[PDB]
Paper text:
Consistent with the results obtained with human BTN3A1 B30.2 domain, HMBPP-08 binds to VpBTN3 B30.2 ΔC domain with higher affinity than HMBPP (KD = 55.7 nM for HMBPP-08, KD = 1.27 μM for HMBPP). To investigate the detailed interactions between HMBPP-08 and VpBTN3 B30.2 ΔC, we obtained the crystal structure of the VpBTN3 B30.2 ΔC domain in complex with HMBPP-08 by soaking HMBPP-08 with the apo-form VpBTN3 B30.2 ΔC crystals. Clear electron density maps of HMBPP-08 can only be observed in chain B. HMBPP-08 binds to a positively charged pocket formed by basic residues (H381, R421, R442, and R448), aromatic residues (W380, Y382, and W421), and a hydrophobic residue (L501). The pyrophosphate group of HMBPP-08 forms hydrogen bonds with the side chain of residues R442, R448, R499, W421 and the main chain N of M424 via a bridging water molecule. Meanwhile, the OH group of HMBPP-08 forms hydrogen bonds with the imidazole group of H381 and the main chain N of Y382. Furthermore, the methylphenyl group of HMBPP-08 forms hydrophobic interactions with residues Y382 and L501. Although there is no direct interaction between residue K423 and HMBPP-08, residue K423 forms part of the positively charged pocket, which is conducive to the binding of pAgs. Unexpectedly, HMBPP-08 did not promote the binding between B30.2 domains of VpBTN2 and VpBTN3, even with its robust affinity for the VpBTN3 B30.2 ΔC domain. Aligning VpBNT3/HMBPP-08 and VpBTN2-DMASPP-VpBTN3 B30.2 structure indicate that the bulky methylphenyl moiety of HMBPP-08 would clash with the loop region consisting of residues 505 to 507 of VpBTN2 B30.2 domain, which prevents HMBPP-08 from associating the VpBTN2 B30.2 domain to the VpBTN3 B30.2 domain.
The primary subtype of γδ T cells, Vγ9Vδ2 T cells, are activated by the non-peptidic phosphoantigens (pAgs). Herrmann's group and our team have recently confirmed that alpaca Vγ9Vδ2 T cells are activated by pAg-binding VpBTN3 (18, 20). Here, we report the crystal structures of alpaca butyrophilin 3 (VpBTN3) B30.2 domain in complex with the exogenous pAg analog, HMBPP-08, which is a valuable tool for studying the mechanism of butyrophilin-dependent Vγ9Vδ2 T cell activation, and the endogenous pAg analogue, dimethylallyl (S)-thiolodiphosphate (DMASPP). The electrostatic surface of the apo-form VpBTN3 B30.2 ΔC structure shows that the pAg-binding site is a positively charged pocket comprising residue W421 and six basic residues (H381, H408, K423, R442, R448, and R499), making it more suitable for binding the negatively charged pyrophosphate group of pAgs.
Residue numbers in the entry: 323 to 513
């Protein structure tokens, strides 16, 4: 209650609430972006889509519709009871076609879940997270100037992970990744 309230007030003191919608033109051909562009699901197989340059052809990734070149931004994602997901930010210049490892070195700052219970930061090497209360809703917090990407349990204000401070190159995009075919979608919370 107090921890929720402190979490709400910290977001207001410091971070601009981003209104994030998914760009279907970036989505891997196995992903479905909802008609309202807030939700993501996976298909049984690749659907037939143009291989336009911005689309992720290998990684099961999709980007937001707007980038960040400066400032403090947050958005929250309802991951619900999904067994698998990764979210965060990536540089505009990430490899979209060939495989690259999703690491900060390759322009990806993401954390997530595998096999229902394995929380990880996709640092290199990967960081094993210990999470006492598994989140249904995750806040993604960006500070462009200080090279800061951090993640919170948006329901109880508990911290999940902060990447080492870095230097970003060029615009950052919200990025979302699902590998599994399971009943719960990934849904962005509007601003």
């Amino acid at each position: 209650g107090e921890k929720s309230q402190a979490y709400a007030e910290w977001k207001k003191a410091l971070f601009q609430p981003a209104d994030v919608i998914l760009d279907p033109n970036t989505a891997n051909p196995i992903l479905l972006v909802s008609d309202d562009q807030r939700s993501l699901q996976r298909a049984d197989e690749r659907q037939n889509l143009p291989d336009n340059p911005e689309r992720f052809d290998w990684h099961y990734c999709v980007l937001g519709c707007k980038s960040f070149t400066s400032g403090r931004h947050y958005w929250e994602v309802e991951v619900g009871d999904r067994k698998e997901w990764h979210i965060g930010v990536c540089q505009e210049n990430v490899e979209r076609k060939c495989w690259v490892k999703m690491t900060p070195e390759n322009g990806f700052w993401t954390v997530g879940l595998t096999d229902g219970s394995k929380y990880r930061a996709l640092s290199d090497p990967r960081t094993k997270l210990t999470v006492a209360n598994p989140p249904q809703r995750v806040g993604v917090f960006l500070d462009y100037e200080t090279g800061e990407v951090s993640f919170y349990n948006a329901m109880d204000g508990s911290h999940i992970y902060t990447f080492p401070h870095t230097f970003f190159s060029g615009p950052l995009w919200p990025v979302f990744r699902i590998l599994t075919l399971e009943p719960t979608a990934l849904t962005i919370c509007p601003a």
